[PDB]
Amino acid sequence: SIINFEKLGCGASGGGGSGGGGSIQKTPQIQVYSRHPPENGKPNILNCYVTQFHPPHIEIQMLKNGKKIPKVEMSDMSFSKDWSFYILAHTEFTPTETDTYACRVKHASMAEPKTVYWDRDMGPHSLRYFVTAVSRPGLGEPRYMEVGYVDDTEFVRFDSDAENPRYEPRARWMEQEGPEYWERETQKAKGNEQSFRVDLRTLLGCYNQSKGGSHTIQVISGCEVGSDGRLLRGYQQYAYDGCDYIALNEDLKTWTAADMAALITKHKWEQAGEAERLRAYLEGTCVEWLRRYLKNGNATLLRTDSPKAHVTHHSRPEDKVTLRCWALGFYPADITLTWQLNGEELIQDMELVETRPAGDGTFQKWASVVVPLGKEQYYTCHVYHQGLPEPLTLRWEP
């Protein structure tokens, strides 16, 4: 159960650089890839994973031979611990030898849309809430969202963009909570929404920003608990336009303000005993609810799916070849892939892709090395994942 938020009540920012006020934007990183190994003539799903961007507004289109693909589904948007947003667009498709696919992204951080072509050569637990408030001049009321996570698995979500917005289960094991829970969480969310609506207004004044621009407030709030059930760490951190604003220190008693506007918030909260209020929530309410949720989803929350790995072989100019080690169908996302040349791990030549969602609950990742033609048997790929009885070791098999 998320905490009830207290307004920030900012002061003049005196902006002369980085503050959370008028954010310097983050450029989207894009990966375009299929969910399953591509086989000409076989139905598949093409994914366009977009990450690391800010502001949250973004336009994504998928293209086939240069023409917009009509039905492209979009996952709900989320953001990461570094405040940046991410989303997954995907479409059903049947690849052929000559059809070209691409993903085009328009975002305020770039002068023009970026088009990326699909190339297919071959113990401890936590309860965290990620909150987003985004003003939208000319597009309606501010959008407000509360997204809850138990150990990185989304389990609840409230999104104001509806006629009767309500807290909703995002994990099937939450269906164990009765009507009272949903009703209470929903009303609390609607109350929190009001506090953020007010803060968006006052921050504009503090940062001397135009009433015509869109701005974002983000919060990460929650607790991390050990296997013995004791609180390991408590979190209450805010960001304005993607930049740190104010955060509760690990002592759960003091605040760290990031700019002059936040200094005023700190003083107000100091005088009002806000840290004391958060400490109580973090050490009690937060931990108690986390225990309840962990009970509710128990096995689901400790599940693993081991990676299925294989190495593919690709030509290069002259006497070189690329060996690519693939890890597919694994869960959770944490994984390590390495390449070794007779006992040593390679850094120099290795290329990697950020771990990405297959779109079915599992993840994918690959790591490659460029090696001399004829020396493929001198290299071995190593795959490390918590679901494996032991690390996988593999080599190119012609």
Swiss-Prot record:
Cysteines engaged in disulfide bonds, as pairs: C223-C286, C325-C381
Record region (Alpha-2): 213-304
GO molecular function: peptide antigen binding
Localization terms from the record: Membrane
Alpha-3 as annotated region, ranges: 305-396
Keyword annotations of the record: Disulfide bond, Glycoprotein, Immunity, Membrane, MHC I, Phosphoprotein, Signal, Transmembrane, Transmembrane helix
UniProt keyword Glycoprotein present: yes
Domain called Ig-like C1-type: residue spans: 307-395
GO biological process: antigen processing and presentation of endogenous peptide antigen via MHC class I via ER pathway, TAP-dependent; antigen processing and presentation of exogenous peptide antigen via MHC class I; defense response to bacterium; inner ear development; negative regulation of neuron projection development; positive regulation of T cell mediated cytotoxicity; T cell mediated cytotoxicity
Residue positions the entry lists as glycosylated: N208, N298
Residue ranges, annotated region (Alpha-1): 123-212
Subunit structure: Heterodimer of an alpha chain and a beta chain (beta-2-microglobulin).
Entry function: Involved in the presentation of foreign antigens to the immune system.
Family of the protein in this entry: Belongs to the MHC class I family.
Listed name of the protein: H-2 class I histocompatibility antigen, K-B alpha chain
Species for this entry: Mus musculus (Mouse)
Gene name of the record: H2-K1
